[PDB]
């Protein structure tokens, strides 16, 4: 579906916060993460452009930088056979992430989030948007266990 897509090598860590930015009590692991992802994703300029236009597109209503749309789209989530439209762009973000050149850099920094932040504390129970995302970075799905 996205013929041609590379992305800009490096475009995310500026938004790769410090170990002390995930010990402040008011830091959101869960936002925060989501846009690190997001950043990752940005198409490089040699993507054709309605490639770009509609991966720009999927990402951003996956993983809005707006918190209240971002928690809009996590309750709709917690019924997501109910969308059906949210599961297919879901699913194939998803399947976007698990061949990111940098997929094993997100990875390790999706498990220092884990360890620093506690993004992974709830398990099987973390949420759809999330967990999809971090089985697209950890294949086998251990982050929760």
């Given amino acids: 579906p996205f013929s041609g897509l590379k992305f800009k ?7 790769v916060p410090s170990v002390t930015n995930m010990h402040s009590m008011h830091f959101d692991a869960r936002e925060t993460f989501l846009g690190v992802i997001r950043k990752a994703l940005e198409p490089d300029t040699s993507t054709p452009f309605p490639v770009r236009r509609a991966f720009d597109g999927l990402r951003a209503e996956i993983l809005p930088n707006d918190t209240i749309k971002s928690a ?3 309750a709709q989530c917690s019924d997501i056979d109910k969308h059906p439209e949210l599961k297919a762009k879901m699913e194939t973000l998803k399947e976007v992430i698990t061949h990111h050149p940098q997929k094993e850099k997100l990875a390790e920094i999706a498990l220092q989030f884990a360890r620093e932040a506690g993004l992974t504390r709830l398990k099987g129970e973390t949420d759809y948007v999330l967990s999809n995302v971090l089985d697209g970075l950890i294949g086998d ?3 929760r266990a």
Avoid: E
């Avoid at 090598?9 to 938004?15: D, G, I, P």
């Fill in 9 to 15: 090598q490096n475009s995310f860590l500026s938004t």
């Fill in 72 to 74: 809009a789209l996590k």
């Fill in 141 to 143: 799905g251990s982050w």
